[PDB]
Amino acid sequence: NTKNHPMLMNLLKD
Amino acid sequence: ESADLRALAKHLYDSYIKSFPLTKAKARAILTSPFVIYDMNSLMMGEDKIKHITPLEVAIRIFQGCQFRSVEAVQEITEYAKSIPGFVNLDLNDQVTLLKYGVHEIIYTMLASLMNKDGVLISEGQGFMTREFLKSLRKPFGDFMEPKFEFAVKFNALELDDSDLAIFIAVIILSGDRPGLLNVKPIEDIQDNLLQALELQLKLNHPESSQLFAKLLQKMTDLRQIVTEHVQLLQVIKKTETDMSLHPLLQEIYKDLY
Ligand SMILES: CN(CCOc1ccc(C[C@@H]2SC(=O)NC2=O)cc1)c1ccccn1
């Protein structure tokens, strides 16, 4: 989920 | 409404073309001239002739080649997922979870587009690494690719085109049974309509093959198993293998995968 996986979040951000 | 499903299929095929530079049509056109890597000597010759950048044992090197390819595949897949109507509304936690569990299944699905029974297009189609050579590799490296080749041979018999694959890939991303999902309800509702779009897509584009939809959905579980077996074989050699250090994006994806 969002806590971990910063790299995934940042690809999803834009 | 059939027309709304033909408009979803068209939007996904357009996004798929925009997101994935090496499509199956280009891959088929090539496979039917790339540098052939078929043994140790042809590999050493190859990486000077031929998509790997960094500050600077063959099995490890080929493995880092695939890792580099993965990282850029995730980026294409992520850009594609964002175009699937309704995906950018799901709980951002659950977008991350779908990406996390979907990305390798898409990678192996699309890897099949670059495979024939004897090898695989590498580095955007400028190379062709033979299945035999990949099999000849030592320890457990000679087993990385073989299940992918066996899957691809059966999957490629379905003769899907890129327009088919755009919806199939989307169906895979929006799986409601991924571990740890918060809101499975709107995910299944998106997936349910993608499956209707896929079904209409397969009846229009493959009128002659009965039960292609059925055969296709069974392949989805094949993909899950391939990734699960890869997960373990990855955890096998993180003990013996001293020289491997997974790319950060990939160790984040693999973190508590399976
Ligand atoms: C055989 N090819 C084509 C790509 O073949 C691939 C095989 C496996 C993957 C998955 C990686 S590998 C791993 O362990 N985890 C991942 O995400 C990704 C691509 C090579 C080989 C060497 C260099 C570049 N291309």
Author numbering:
A (entry chain C): 638 to 651
B (entry chain A): 207 to 238, 245 to 262, 265 to 270, 276 to 477
The article reads:
Proliferator-activated receptor gamma (PPARγ), a NR that regulates gene programs that influence cellular metabolism, differentiation, and insulin sensitization, is regulated by endogenous cellular lipids and synthetic ligands, including the thiazolidinedione (TZD) class of antidiabetic drugs. NRs are modular domain proteins containing an N-terminal disordered activation function-1 (AF-1) region, a central DNA-binding domain, and C-terminal ligand-binding domain (LBD) containing the ligand-dependent activation function-2 (AF-2) coregulator binding surface. Agonist binding to the NR orthosteric ligand-binding pocket stabilizes the C-terminal structural element in the LBD, helix 12, in an active conformation that facilitates binding of LXXLL-containing motifs present in transcriptional coactivator proteins. Our data inform a refined model for ligand-induced activation of PPARγ and a potential molecular guide for designing corepressor-selective PPARγ inverse agonists.
We solved the crystal structures of T0070907-bound PPARγ LBD with NCoR ID2 and SMRT ID2 peptides at 1.8 and 2.1 Å, respectively. We also solved the crystal structure of rosiglitazone-bound PPARγ LBD with TRAP220 coactivator peptide to 2.3 Å resolution to compare the transcriptionally active conformation with the corepressor-bound transcriptionally repressive conformations. Rosiglitazone binds in the orthosteric ligand-binding pocket and forms hydrogen bonds with residues near the AF-2 surface including the side chain phenolic hydroxyl group of Y473 on helix 12, which stabilizes helix 12 into an active conformation. Helix 3 forms an extended linear conformation connecting the flexible Ω-loop to helix 2b and the β-sheet via β-strand 1. In the active conformation, fewer interactions facilitate binding of the coactivator peptide. The charge clamp residues, K301 and E471 in helix 3 and helix 12, respectively, mediate the primary interactions with the coactivator peptide helix. However, the extended N-terminal loop of the coactivator peptide interacts with N312 in helix 5, G399 in the helix 8–9 loop, and K474 on helix 12. This extended N-terminal coactivator interaction with the helix 8–9 loop to our knowledge has not been described in other published coactivator peptide-bound PPARγ crystals structures. PRE analysis in the active conformation using MTSL-labeled rosiglitazone-bound [K474C/C285S]-PPARγ LBD in the presence of TRAP220 ID2 peptide reveals localized effects on helix 11, helix 12, and AF-2 surface residues on helix 5 (Y320, G321), consistent with the active conformation crystal structure.
